[PDB]
């Protein structure tokens, strides 16, 4: 039983160091900054056609084409500017829960209850979308996936492990372990050297795509973490959980930075995404509304409240010109500001 | 501007295909099959087929020219509070429980409690299939094991007049079966106000009428939501 005591005492040492690394709270330093005020976002566009609840969507580098996955078995790539449906891919498994858009835009990834990551090519010679690869090896359902490039893909599964796969070989180049719970969501850093992941264990972990080891773990949450997203600078990230609380973690600080929660909010957070500048933190909630808070002052700045069901996915374009929200009403909604 | 017209035509074709896939999609009903290792749900799949780390298996069958898709979660960790939310829109949940195993008839009851009390499963009617009736009957008739050891209230329980035992059925086996049925029905009626209903059925793994019972249950469920939708209720 010596190892358990060693773990406990070294955890106490880590906590002592972290508190020693705590001089002032983010509220104290940011008390003098001008508040954002009220953010009134308008529904500029409404995308319809999905048969069932959307579970995931992702923007592209073009900031014009967006891929959305619905649990009816359809992966639809929409042209946001014109509302027209560009692609509609019928999936082999209906229970899709995640999808990704490659930075180059030539490939699209998806997955779900079936422990397979399906990669489809959008630039086929015949002009007909065909599945390019079916990565397999995970012992649990696929929860999230993101593209490092056209040949490397990072995915998370319910087996409590993440995996970096090389598409051409169809083999998992690296496996990431350490989570004791179901891996919910992963976010890639801007420089694609490190990525964070939340795995239902009241904690999030940082991983290296090249070394395949865990660097830091943050355990400020009280329940399962559902969504994770990187700060635009890549130096911090935000996590939402079923405890109806969002938390900001800075990698260097190695501890919680700010907590976003309110008494009237007693429902879990399903999605989280930062803006281009990172000042506004957008989160989707099970109460059928999306809340945008001040990343510094931590006060609620705006609410969308336009969906008839829980918000399942939230995304922001690379240029921050629009926000795409997909709920279980089978409708994505593009919101933008007005002046 | 010709490329714009081509894009509009492509969108029109995609919309036509999507509409064809919506007629097709509302023409079929989705079912979620849940159970434990003791439950013979795999045998149920291999018997209703008459009509790899895959993760999930799909079984498509047809009754009265109505297509039913059943999904069995195959390769997932024992934790299930997350992916279960994927089935918040299925037509029904077929829960298979071994009535001939008392040591784990309480774990199954807890699982049923969780399913019934789940926020995302408040609107899904659960089809309760009390499987392996022959094993339970033989176990009760042998007398080696007593239900009272695991459920003391069984001593006070008495067979209700609503029971319709099969001919030649012993009083004791009927009493045990209906005690289990009422144990499940207590949790079923503990929560839920006309949103989702439980249908207890005395079924065995080797039976050709399970598909018909599921079809009737789906008919009743669709009828109830049509009553609600059409403002009749």
């Amino acid at each position: 039983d010596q190892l358990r005591q060693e773990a406990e005492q070294l955890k106490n040492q880590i906590r002592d160091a972290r508190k020693a690394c705590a001089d002032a709270t983010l509220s104290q330093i940011t008390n003098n900054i001008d508040p954002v005020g009220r953010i009134q976002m308008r529904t500029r566009r409404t995308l319809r056609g999905h048969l069932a609840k959307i579970y995931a969507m992702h923007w592209g580098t073009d900031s014009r084409l967006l891929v959305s996955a619905s649990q009816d078995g359809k992966l639809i790539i929409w042209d946001s500017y014109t509302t027209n449906k560009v692609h509609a891919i019928p999936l082999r498994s209906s229970w899709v829960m995640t999808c990704a858009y490659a930075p180059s835009g030539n490939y699209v990834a998806c997955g779900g209850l079936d422990n397979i990551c399906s990669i489809y090519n959008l630039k086929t010679r015949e002009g007909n979308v065909r599945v390019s690869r079916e990565l397999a090896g995970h012992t649990g359902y696929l929860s999230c996936c993101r593209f490092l490039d056209d040949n490397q893909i990072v995915t998370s599964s319910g087996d409590t492990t993440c995996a970096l796969w090389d598409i051409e070989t169809g083999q998992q180049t690296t496996t990431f372990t350490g989570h004791t719970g179901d891996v919910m969501s992963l976010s890639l850093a801007p420089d694609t050297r490190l990525f964070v992941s939340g795995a239902c264990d009241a904690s999030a972990k940082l991983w290296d795509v090249r070394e395949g080891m865990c660097r830091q773990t943050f355990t400020g949450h009280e329940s399962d973490i559902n969504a994770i997203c990187f700060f635009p600078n890549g130096n911090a990230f935000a996590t939402g959980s079923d405890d109806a609380t969002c938390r900001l973690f800075d990698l260097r600080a190695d501890q919680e930075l700010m907590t976003y929660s309110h008494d009237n909010i007693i429902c879990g957070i399903t999605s989280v995404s930062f803006s281009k500048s990172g000042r506004l933190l957008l989160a989707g909630y099970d109460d059928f509304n999306c809340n945008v808070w001040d990343a510094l002052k931590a006060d609620r700045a705006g609410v969308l409240a336009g969906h008839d069901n829980r918000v399942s996915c939230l995304g922001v374009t690379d240029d921050g010109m629009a926000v795409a929200t997909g709920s279980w009403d089978s409708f994505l909604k593009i919101w933008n500001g007005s002046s | 501007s010709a490329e714009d017209k081509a894009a509009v035509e492509r969108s029109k074709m995609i919309e036509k295909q999507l509409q064809k896939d919506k007629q097709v999609y509302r023409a079929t009903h989705r079912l979620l099959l849940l159970g434990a290792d003791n439950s013979g749900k795999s045998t149920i799949v291999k018997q209703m087929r008459i009509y790899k780390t895959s993760g999930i298996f799909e079984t498509k069958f047809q009754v009265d020219k109505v297509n039913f898709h059943m999904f069995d979660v195959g390769a997932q960790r024992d934790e299930r509070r997350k992916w279960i939310q994927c089935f918040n829109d299925v037509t029904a949940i077929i829960f298979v429980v071994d009535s001939s195993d008392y040591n784990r008839l309480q774990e199954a009851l807890n699982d049923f409690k969780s399913i019934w009390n789940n926020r995302w499963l408040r609107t899904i009617s659960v089809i309760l299939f009390l499987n392996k009736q022959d094993l339970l009957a033989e176990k009760v008739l042998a007398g080696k094991s007593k239900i009272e050891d695991y459920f003391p209230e069984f001593a006070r329980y008495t067979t209700p007049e609503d029971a319709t035992p099969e001919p030649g059925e012993d009083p004791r086996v009927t009493r045990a079966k209906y005690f289990i049925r009422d144990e499940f029905l207590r949790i079923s009626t503990a929560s839920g106000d006309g949103r989702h209903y439980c249908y207890p059925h005395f079924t065995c793994s080797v039976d050709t009428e399970n598909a018909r019972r599921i079809f009737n249950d789906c008919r009743d469920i669709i009828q109830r939501m049509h009553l609600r939708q059409y403002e009749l209720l």
Partner: nanobody
Framework: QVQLQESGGGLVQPGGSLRLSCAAS????????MNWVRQAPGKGLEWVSD????????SYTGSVKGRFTISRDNAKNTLYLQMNSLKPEDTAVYYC?????????????????????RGQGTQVTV
Amino acid sequence: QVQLQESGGGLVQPGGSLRLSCAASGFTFSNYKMNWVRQAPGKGLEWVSDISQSGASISYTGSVKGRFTISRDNAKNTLYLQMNSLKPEDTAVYYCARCPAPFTRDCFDVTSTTYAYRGQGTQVTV
């Protein structure tokens, strides 16, 4: 951060009484439904009892319905399980489990292996 440490237990002859405590840290004890589970040597994680947030709702298993009692203290943020009239077959490792999400009546995975929000457990021998 989320910790659930169990205290008490030991070698007690049949027919005795034992009060086991659950100390909770890293979360709001008043907003979570609590459960007591057991694992006997060579057996699976058997559920024992559950208590709601306010304590107005309480449930047990048949084997311990008339024997065990459960209580909670939100002021101290702790759980209490009092066993009376112990039996030889009660020897096991008893864990103190928290439900996944707050403000819910659903406790789905409190018996699953490698559960994150379950305590280390306390040994009871009889």
